[PDB]
Structures are given as C-alpha cells and as structure tokens.
Amino acid sequence: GRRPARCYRYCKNKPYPKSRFCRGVPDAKIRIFDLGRKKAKVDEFPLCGHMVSDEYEQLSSEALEAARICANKYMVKSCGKDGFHIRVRLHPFHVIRINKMLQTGMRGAFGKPQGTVARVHIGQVIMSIRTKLQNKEHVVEALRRAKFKFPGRQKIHISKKWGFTKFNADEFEDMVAEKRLIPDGCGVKYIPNRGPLDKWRALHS
Amino acid sequence: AKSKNHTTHNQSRKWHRNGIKKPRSQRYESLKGVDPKFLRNMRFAKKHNKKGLKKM
C-alpha cells in the first residue's frame, strides 16, 4: 500500500522532477494518457468537454489513472466503442519523498522517492473528452463521476473550441472552406500567407 | 546540546545606531600604489621647478 493523499496534497516544495540528481523513482500508475478512438478526424468529433481545476493542489498519478478508467468505462457504456476520445492533460512529473523509519531519529531525514504526483494550477484543465454534439449529456456525467476520484474542487466546461483545436466552433468549417485550416489527423494545421508561393499554388491545386 | 548556527538579525539595527560613516574624502589623496616609473619622473619634475623660476 501507501500513505493518504492528505500528506502530499498541497504544492509545498519546489518542483523536484525525475533527473540525474533524483534517480531511484518508481514508474507512474498513469502511463496511457489518451484513449477511446484516438485515430479520429477533427470534423467527426465537433463537441469538446473539459474538467477544469479550482485549487492550487498536487493530484496523484494513481488518482489520474483511477479518474481515466472511471470516465473511460462510463463513456464506453454510454456512447460505445468508437464515439469519443479522452486525453488526461496532467503528466505526473513531481517526485514526492518519504523519510522511511524501518531506529534512527531525525539525524539527516531526507526522503527516498515514494512516487510521482501531477502538480496543478487554478483554471488548468485536468482531463478533456471530445465527441459528437449528440453526446453532450454523457461527457458531463463522465467528468462529473471522474471528480469523485480527486481531492479539492473540480469544475466542468463544454468549450467553444472545435474538439482538440485552437479555433472556435463557429469559425472552423468556414475557415476550412476558405483553406486557412488543414485537417491533420486529430488536430488542424493553420497555414498563413507567409511561406513561398509554391505552397499556395499546391494548396489551390 | 545543539545551538543556533548563524543569523544577521539585530545587525542592520546595530550598524545604523552610530550611523554608517563614509570614508574621510579630502583634496590631495596620497600617491601610494601609483606606477613608480611615473612617480619617480613626477618627483624629478617637482625637484626641477626652481630652474625655470625667472621666466615664471
């Protein structure tokens, strides 16, 4: 087993990452960050949900895996096999230490690494599920369930962005039709009026 | 028995009680630490001032 999160909850220390200075770190419980039908086009999943943080706190690697599996298997039960794509948007890069007793005292109590923890800011996104506009009241439930495997306060926000892109939902398909945006797998490539002109003629071929 | 290792707590307060006095700056600073070729020549120039006294 291990300790409670209560012990390692607040952002107390400077970010002490896995380096050539800190070696002897165990592997994180969250390894698979993005799952569902990840190999999906931008157009076919227009809606995007986010679960946004509210406290300045450390979230466990184990809590991120638990929240991912919970959200996953609700969205699998809700919309099925190929009707969503989850990303976990916090990579646990903070080593937490533990001064292990087992007869010493406090003669030089600098800890050995226990595990990895994902340090968060206020308004920073934890997870995000992109799907159809049909599955609007499935995403919110999925992320509302995911909240329970976390400490502190978590808000939910159905975003103005077209899926996992950097552009608003009511500019996107007009900007594709005027060839300012290029479908690029799960994302979109914004190509402005700045390169050579062979770029422009090959675009309008 | 252990003890407190180091501080500089009451020291700012201590320094300012009698005030921080700047170095006693004057006209005519000493020629100690000046280039001793330049300095020996300057001394010959001083020594040989009265030779051209009649024109002065």
Partner: protein
C-alpha cells in the same frame, strides 16, 4: 532519410563572425597586438605600415588606429612608378622596393624630415636601420602589418620594408626573411639581396629563356618586348627610378571630372511593387487553371 543540420533552430542559435573575418581579410588575433596602445601613452598614435600584394599591384600605407576607423596618413601604389621609369614588372621585388622607398620619401616630405634623415643612398641590402640625430626631430618609428601572407624568406612585403628602411623609416626588423639568407648556413649574403633589389633574378630568367626558347620567352615576357626593356636596361631602369623618387616624391592628385550621374545598378524594389507582383502571380495562376480544366 537523415537529420537536416541547418535547422530553423541552427539559424536562431547561429552567431555570425566579424565582417572582415567573414569576407576573409583581417586577422583580429594579429590586429589586437599590432594596433592597440599602452594605456600610459594616451592618444600617442601607434603607426603601422600596411603592405598588400594583389595580382597586378602593391599597396603600401601608413595608418594609426582610432575608434571611428584607422586613419591612413600616406599611401604609395605600384601604378605610380610609371611616372618615375618602371613601366612593366609591378608585382616583383624591385617594384616592392621602389613602392616602400616612395612611401618613406612621401611621408618625410609631408612632415618636413626629407633633408634630415636622407637614408641609405647607395643601395646594398646590408643590415641598415635609421639612427635619430641630436637636436633634430626623432625618426618615424612604424611596425610592419604583414597581413595574412605567409612571411617566408624573400616575401615581397620585406622588399617594401627594405625600401622604407633605406628611405628613412625606423622599422624594427632582422635580416632572417630578406633574400640571400641561407637557411642551413644561417648567415646573410647581402649581394643576393642586392641582385633581387636591382631585379637581376628577372634579367637572369630573361637570358635563360632568350638562350633556351625565344617562343617560351614571347609567352612569359610578352609586355617587356612591347616597351623593349632588356636585361642590361634592367639595373639602370631601377637605379634611375630610385633617384627620380628621392628627387620628387610629392603626389599630384588626379583631378575630378563632371558627373552625368547615370546609374548602372538595379534600385531596391518598393513594398507596393512587391505586393502587386504577388497579386499578379496569384491572379495569373487561376487565369491558367480555368482555361486548362
């Protein structure tokens, strides 16, 4: 495929070298030592003699360094010697000698030390260098700026050093890099220097071709026969030119002609023209596309 070494990050991180070093002209490792002054001298100008041998010319200057850019007091080119006698052979050791001599005579005339510090009048090639006289102004001391040219024995820059030395300039040097220095014997033959100074290594090669093949002579010495300057004219043509340079080194300038102010280059294109070009290009692409399909 393999990684592109001129990345966009390469260009970001990339720092250009000093312009002269990029172009390939100035050694800044040399300049720092040659140019700057002992800080307990204060605006005492540090004089250096610049000898540069091009494909068809020999450029000899005297400079002192400033923060704006080193100010050239005096200049003597190799294409000024045609005034004084020497028409052909302007990038050889006797040309270098007359140029270095002429630069010394021109300087000493400008600063009024032409009659004081005559110099070595009868040219021999010996270890000469100038003594300053009691009461008179001191001799002009300057240091040779060799440049990038590999300074091995009988380099043409040392001919120019020798001419200026005999002219009255007080250059510090040794006679290890003058011709006639035997590398193995490690002694100095002043006569082999004098042959080089008076240009008989030219005259001996002219004889060598004129007795071996007169058609190989026609190819090599082509412009000597345009003037008819011959192996026994050779010494008289230089020892006359030395006397002519010493008699009158004062430089009469080439006077300015009225300009038409006609331009030869293409001027820098405007923003409006650059934007209209792209408008015309994009227009004519979709002009061609609708007529094609």
């Amino acid at each position: 495929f393999v990684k592109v070494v001129k990345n966009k990050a390469y260009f970001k991180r990339y720092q250009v070298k000093f312009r002269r070093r990029r172009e390939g002209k100035t050694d800044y490792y040399a300049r720092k030592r040659l140019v700057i002054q002992d800080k307990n001298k204060y605006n005492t100008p540090k004089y250096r003699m610049i000898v540069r041998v091009t494909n068809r010319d020999i450029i000899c200057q005297i400079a002192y360094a400033r923060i704006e850019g080193d100010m050239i007091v005096c200049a003597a080119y190799a294409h000024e010697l045609p005034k004084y006698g020497v028409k052909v052979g302007l990038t050889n050791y006797a040309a270098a000698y007359c140029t270095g001599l002429l630069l010394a005579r021109r300087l000493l005339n400008r600063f009024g030390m032409d009659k004081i510090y005559e110099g070595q009048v009868e040219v021999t090639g010996d270890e000469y260098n100038v003594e300053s006289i009691d009461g008179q102004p001191g001799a002009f001391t300057c240091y040779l700026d060799a440049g990038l040219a590999r300074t091995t024995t009988g380099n043409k820059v040392f001919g120019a050093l020798k001419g200026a030395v005999d002219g009255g300039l007080s250059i510090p040097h040794s006679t290890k890099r003058f011709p006639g220095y035997d590398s193995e014997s490690k002694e100095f033959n002043a006569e082999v220097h004098r042959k080089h100074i008076m240009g008989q290594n030219v005259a001996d090669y002219m004889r060598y071709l004129m007795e071996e093949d007169e058609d190989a002579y026609k190819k090599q010495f082509s412009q000597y026969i345009k003037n008819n300057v011959t192996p026994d004219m050779m010494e008289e043509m230089y020892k006359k030119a030395h006397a002519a340079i010493r008699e009158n080194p004062v430089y009469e300038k080439k006077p300015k002609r009225e300009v038409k102010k006609k331009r030869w280059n293409r001027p820098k294109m405007s923003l409006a023209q650059k934007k209209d070009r792209v408008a015309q290009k994009k227009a004519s692409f979709l002009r061609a596309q609708e007529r094609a399909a």
